[PDB]
Design an enzyme around this catalytic site. Structure first.
Site, PDB file in Angstrom:
ATOM      1  N   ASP A  97       0.891  -1.689  -0.070  1.00  0.00           N
ATOM      2  CA  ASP A  97       0.113  -0.015  -0.204  1.00  0.00           C
ATOM      3  C   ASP A  97       0.923   1.275  -0.769  1.00  0.00           C
ATOM      4  O   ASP A  97       2.696   0.981   0.038  1.00  0.00           O
ATOM      5  CB  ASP A  97      -1.135   0.071   1.563  1.00  0.00           C
ATOM      6  CG  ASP A  97      -0.317  -0.175   2.486  1.00  0.00           C
ATOM      7  OD1 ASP A  97       0.687   0.401   2.666  1.00  0.00           O
ATOM      8  OD2 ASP A  97      -1.115  -0.733   3.614  1.00  0.00           O
ATOM      9  N   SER A  98       0.006   1.882  -0.246  1.00  0.00           N
ATOM     10  CA  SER A  98       1.194   3.467  -0.144  1.00  0.00           C
ATOM     11  C   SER A  98       1.757   4.155   1.144  1.00  0.00           C
ATOM     12  O   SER A  98       2.368   4.857   1.078  1.00  0.00           O
ATOM     13  CB  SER A  98       0.370   4.743  -0.716  1.00  0.00           C
ATOM     14  OG  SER A  98      -0.566   5.137  -0.073  1.00  0.00           O
ATOM     15  N   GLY A  99       0.571   3.336   2.549  1.00  0.00           N
ATOM     16  CA  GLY A  99       1.517   4.015   3.669  1.00  0.00           C
ATOM     17  C   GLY A  99       0.326   5.648   3.794  1.00  0.00           C
ATOM     18  O   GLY A  99       0.497   6.066   5.314  1.00  0.00           O
ATOM     19  N   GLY A 100      -0.483   5.968   2.862  1.00  0.00           N
ATOM     20  CA  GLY A 100      -1.329   7.289   3.617  1.00  0.00           C
ATOM     21  C   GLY A 100      -2.431   6.865   4.592  1.00  0.00           C
ATOM     22  O   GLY A 100      -2.749   7.722   4.695  1.00  0.00           O
ATOM     23  N   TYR A 101      -2.596   5.774   3.995  1.00  0.00           N
ATOM     24  CA  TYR A 101      -4.263   5.145   5.131  1.00  0.00           C
ATOM     25  C   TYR A 101      -3.770   5.886   6.265  1.00  0.00           C
ATOM     26  O   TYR A 101      -3.790   5.957   6.942  1.00  0.00           O
ATOM     27  CB  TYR A 101      -4.354   4.209   4.745  1.00  0.00           C
ATOM     28  CG  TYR A 101      -5.678   4.287   5.623  1.00  0.00           C
ATOM     29  CD1 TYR A 101      -7.424   4.864   5.575  1.00  0.00           C
ATOM     30  CD2 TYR A 101      -5.861   2.986   6.177  1.00  0.00           C
ATOM     31  CE1 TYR A 101      -8.139   4.722   6.098  1.00  0.00           C
ATOM     32  CE2 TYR A 101      -7.107   2.683   7.290  1.00  0.00           C
ATOM     33  CZ  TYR A 101      -8.013   3.874   7.091  1.00  0.00           C
ATOM     34  OH  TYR A 101      -9.205   3.212   8.171  1.00  0.00           O
ATOM     35  N   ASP A 149      -2.917   8.330  -2.453  1.00  0.00           N
ATOM     36  CA  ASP A 149      -4.104   8.885  -2.044  1.00  0.00           C
ATOM     37  C   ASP A 149      -4.408  10.043  -0.812  1.00  0.00           C
ATOM     38  O   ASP A 149      -3.713   9.703  -0.024  1.00  0.00           O
ATOM     39  CB  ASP A 149      -5.151   8.406  -2.880  1.00  0.00           C
ATOM     40  CG  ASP A 149      -5.836   7.141  -1.873  1.00  0.00           C
ATOM     41  OD1 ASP A 149      -4.624   7.319  -0.961  1.00  0.00           O
ATOM     42  OD2 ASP A 149      -6.286   7.054  -1.678  1.00  0.00           O
ATOM     43  N   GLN A 196     -11.602   7.585  -5.386  1.00  0.00           N
ATOM     44  CA  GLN A 196     -12.649   8.133  -3.920  1.00  0.00           C
ATOM     45  C   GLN A 196     -13.923   8.759  -5.032  1.00  0.00           C
ATOM     46  O   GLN A 196     -14.225   8.617  -6.122  1.00  0.00           O
ATOM     47  CB  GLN A 196     -11.530   9.576  -3.825  1.00  0.00           C
ATOM     48  CG  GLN A 196      -9.897   8.824  -3.252  1.00  0.00           C
ATOM     49  CD  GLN A 196     -10.430   7.447  -1.878  1.00  0.00           C
ATOM     50  OE1 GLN A 196     -11.698   7.509  -1.134  1.00  0.00           O
ATOM     51  NE2 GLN A 196      -9.669   6.575  -1.548  1.00  0.00           N
ATOM     52  N   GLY A 223     -12.180   4.632  -0.141  1.00  0.00           N
ATOM     53  CA  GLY A 223     -13.297   5.094   0.769  1.00  0.00           C
ATOM     54  C   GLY A 223     -14.261   4.466   1.081  1.00  0.00           C
ATOM     55  O   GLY A 223     -15.547   5.182   1.581  1.00  0.00           O
ATOM     56  N   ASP A 273      -7.698  -7.825   1.053  1.00  0.00           N
ATOM     57  CA  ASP A 273      -6.827  -8.274   1.682  1.00  0.00           C
ATOM     58  C   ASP A 273      -7.726  -7.457   2.876  1.00  0.00           C
ATOM     59  O   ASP A 273      -8.523  -6.639   3.068  1.00  0.00           O
ATOM     60  CB  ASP A 273      -5.820  -7.348   1.259  1.00  0.00           C
ATOM     61  CG  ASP A 273      -6.207  -5.691   1.688  1.00  0.00           C
ATOM     62  OD1 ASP A 273      -6.239  -4.739   0.495  1.00  0.00           O
ATOM     63  OD2 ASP A 273      -5.712  -5.295   2.761  1.00  0.00           O
ATOM     64  N   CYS A 311     -13.371 -28.085   5.713  1.00  0.00           N
ATOM     65  CA  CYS A 311     -12.219 -27.000   5.607  1.00  0.00           C
ATOM     66  C   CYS A 311     -10.915 -28.739   4.905  1.00  0.00           C
ATOM     67  O   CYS A 311     -10.771 -29.359   5.766  1.00  0.00           O
ATOM     68  CB  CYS A 311     -11.564 -26.176   6.738  1.00  0.00           C
ATOM     69  SG  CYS A 311     -10.154 -25.715   6.484  1.00  0.00           S
ATOM     70  N   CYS A 313      -7.907 -27.374   4.881  1.00  0.00           N
ATOM     71  CA  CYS A 313      -6.200 -27.412   5.770  1.00  0.00           C
ATOM     72  C   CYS A 313      -5.780 -28.231   6.432  1.00  0.00           C
ATOM     73  O   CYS A 313      -6.838 -29.021   7.185  1.00  0.00           O
ATOM     74  CB  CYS A 313      -6.529 -25.669   6.000  1.00  0.00           C
ATOM     75  SG  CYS A 313      -6.965 -25.792   8.214  1.00  0.00           S
ATOM     76  N   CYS A 316      -7.148 -28.583   9.820  1.00  0.00           N
ATOM     77  CA  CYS A 316      -8.594 -29.166   9.918  1.00  0.00           C
ATOM     78  C   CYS A 316      -8.262 -30.948   9.676  1.00  0.00           C
ATOM     79  O   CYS A 316      -8.846 -31.626  10.173  1.00  0.00           O
ATOM     80  CB  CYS A 316     -10.037 -28.887   9.381  1.00  0.00           C
ATOM     81  SG  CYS A 316     -10.466 -27.126  10.217  1.00  0.00           S
ATOM     82  N   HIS A 342      -5.635 -22.313   9.781  1.00  0.00           N
ATOM     83  CA  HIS A 342      -6.830 -22.136   8.849  1.00  0.00           C
ATOM     84  C   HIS A 342      -7.520 -20.818   8.951  1.00  0.00           C
ATOM     85  O   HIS A 342      -8.343 -21.621   7.116  1.00  0.00           O
ATOM     86  CB  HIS A 342      -7.804 -22.970  10.617  1.00  0.00           C
ATOM     87  CG  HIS A 342      -9.012 -22.932  10.234  1.00  0.00           C
ATOM     88  ND1 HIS A 342     -10.030 -24.021   9.702  1.00  0.00           N
ATOM     89  CD2 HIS A 342     -10.033 -22.003  10.278  1.00  0.00           C
ATOM     90  CE1 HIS A 342     -11.123 -23.300   9.037  1.00  0.00           C
ATOM     91  NE2 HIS A 342     -11.655 -22.262   9.665  1.00  0.00           N
TER      92      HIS A 342
END
Ligand SMILES: [Zn+2]
Ligand SMILES: [Zn+2]
Lengths: 379, 379
Positions: A97-101, A149, A196, A223, A273, A311, A313, A316, A342
């Site tokens: 990510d950009s780091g801005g959030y 952004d 946005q 957003g 994500d 599941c 995995c 499980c 899991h």
């Protein structure tokens, strides 16, 4: 196939059902099956899952948090160690990510230039901007780079939403040019832009037009998942996703719960994500096809069934609810490791069922079946 | 009681039943309830149980292996670190063996003077003798010191048994004098002598007379549990223990299985040590009132009962056979830790039942009940 050339970024759609798509993103470090879920990575240490464990859950790509990596150990140090892939022990694609959030969410100066902030970890001064964010993501060596952004709060006045969207589009062009200025980055990585406009249709359209004019490899819907409730997020997605270029991937950042993901794919989202699988696992909560469960509940102390009886995995296949219950109640780190593994694998199996059902033209039925059972909660 | 003076070594017998006794050994670092089981200690590291866990199982005293401690990190280094109590994190009494058995069992020179050997760990040359062994046990700072003797092999010719017993008695006097030569050791620790003589009654009598003439704080029966079978060990104990002074503790070194312990107490033994609880725990074997069990057995994979349904230990209050089965099958170190803790606690609960049954005059019945159930194996 192993001996054939690998493209920088190639999105192919193999099958569609309504607004939903399934396909592949081919990149130099591997193929990403879409719709895709990206677990959120951390440093490869004894405190987290091993990278080979994360891969075995089915993840094709992971996310790195640029803000946290800037603060510790720093982007220059990660570059010196060989980049984020070497740092994290993950040789497949990484999105940053950009780091801005996290700048907003977690501040010495702020303007159209960018932002300056101090670190809570040591008081160091740090600066972010479209140019600096792209530069840091280059130092990290990530494969998918997010444009920098400006986040609009929730709820947001239509004036604040307009102001942040317009600044974000000027910053999207600056992100584009900074990325293109670095030959090593532009030839080997990809760049996503972020729409946005808050809940306002005309602003979302303005934003989409601006990003399409600039041109990106993929387009995120920004957003959302900031407190608006699922009904509203779905309503915004209903008109916002069709505005983005059809032949490029669509990314819904920070989403989310399993039912959020299903509904967003019904609305044209290709990528997701969330920290939820990990946060839940550390807190003793498991996702199941019958809804989430709290493994500390007394009803699980003698339950010999796995966390989820469908599941696939590795957890499980071996561990019962009763024994994971015992580990978690004792505070043994193994308990949290198993539930995290899991949960991430459950998310990947959700994505695989989504992909298979789209390919077979039965995704609308899958989504209805999924909701009926997930919300009945006969766990 | 906490504010009252503590004696160097005071053995009191509170109750008897036949040849069995129960009582206490009071020492400066604490009270030892007898009959006593001494777990075999190692360095206080992440690889072993925590010392507070060992104490909570009921152990009043632990054993240190002088030979291993000499080789790593060495007795001088342990003294510099404050002694074995500081090294092991154990502030209650510690018994050390002389080091002589592991010399034979695990060799540059050998004579009546003592022995010289090379370390398999680094090739260093080491020497042991009655004087050097007592000196090393002083550096370790242990509370009960074993005299240095010569082990006779099994089986042993009556000539070899006579030769080793006679040398052991000359070495017992040398041990006595070395211990008495060091005021700090003689005033604060205790010294045990070791009867030898193999399976031969007249040699055991000679040995007992020699040790009683020298004088010791306690008397061990040496030369057993070296492959002779239980029937024979019991036969030797039948005539050997009555030869030792009645008013001093009787120590059977390196014994043993739960049924060995019960039968030896019936024959007048007050003290025991064995690596069996730990060795078994690391190998996935648990002691129960119904005999030992191999937790890897399929029958335990769904068994919600604790390792032993009458065991009071912290493990059996919480963990099921099914979950310890899962941990052991996965190779998780926690599995071995839990089974080791349970096995040591089971041994302590065995000793407590022995002590209580002697005090109540029902030990002969306890021993019969114990054998009937332990050997039926309805686990
Ligand atoms: Zn699972
Ligand atoms: Zn137990």
């Amino acid at each position: 196939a192993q001996e054939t050339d690998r493209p920088r970024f190639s999105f192919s759609i193999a099958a569609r059902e309504g607004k939903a798509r399934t396909g592949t993103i081919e990149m130099k470090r591997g193929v990403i099956r879409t719709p895709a879920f990206m677990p959120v990575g951390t440093a490869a240490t004894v405190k987290a899952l091993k990278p080979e464990t994360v891969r075995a859950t089915g993840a094709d790509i992971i996310l790195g948090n640029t803000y946290h990596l800037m603060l510790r150990p720093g982007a220059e140090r990660i570059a010196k160690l060989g980049g984020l892939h070497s740092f994290m022990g993950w040789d497949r694609p990484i999105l940053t990510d950009s780091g801005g959030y996290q700048v907003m969410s977690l501040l010495t100066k702020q303007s159209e230039e960018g932002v300056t902030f101090k670190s809570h970890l040591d008081g160091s001064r740090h600066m972010l901007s479209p140019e600096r964010s792209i530069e840091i993501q280059h130092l990290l060596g990530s494969d998918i780079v997010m444009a920098f952004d400006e986040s609009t709060p929730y709820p947001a006045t239509p004036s604040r939403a307009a102001s942040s969207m317009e600044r974000s589009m000027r910053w999207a062009k600056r992100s584009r040019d900074a990325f293109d200025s670095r030959k090593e980055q532009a030839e080997n990585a990809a760049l996503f832009g972020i729409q946005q406009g808050s809940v306002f249709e005309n602003l979302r359209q303005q934003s989409a037009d601006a990003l399409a004019e600039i041109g990106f490899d993929g387009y995120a819907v920004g957003g959302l998942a900031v407190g608006e409730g699922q009904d509203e997020m779905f309503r915004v997605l209903d008109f916002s996703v069709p505005m983005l270029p059809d032949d490029k991937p669509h990314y819904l950042m920070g989403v989310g719960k399993p039912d959020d993901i299903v509904g967003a794919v019904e609305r044209g989202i290709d990528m997701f994500d969330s920290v939820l699988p990990t946060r839940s696992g550390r807190n003793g909560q498991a996702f199941t096809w019958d809804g989430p469960i709290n493994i500390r509940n007394a009803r699980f102390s003698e339950d010999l069934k796995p966390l989820d009886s469908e599941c696939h995995c590795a957890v499980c296949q071996k561990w019962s609810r009763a024994c994971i219950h015992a580990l978690i109640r004792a505070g043994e780190i193994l308990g949290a490791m198993l539930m995290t593994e899991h949960n991430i694998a459950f998310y990947q199996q959700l994505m695989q069922k989504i992909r298979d059902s789209i390919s077979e033209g039965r995704f609308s039925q899958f989504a209805q079946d999924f909701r009926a059972r997930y919300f009945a909660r006969n766990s």
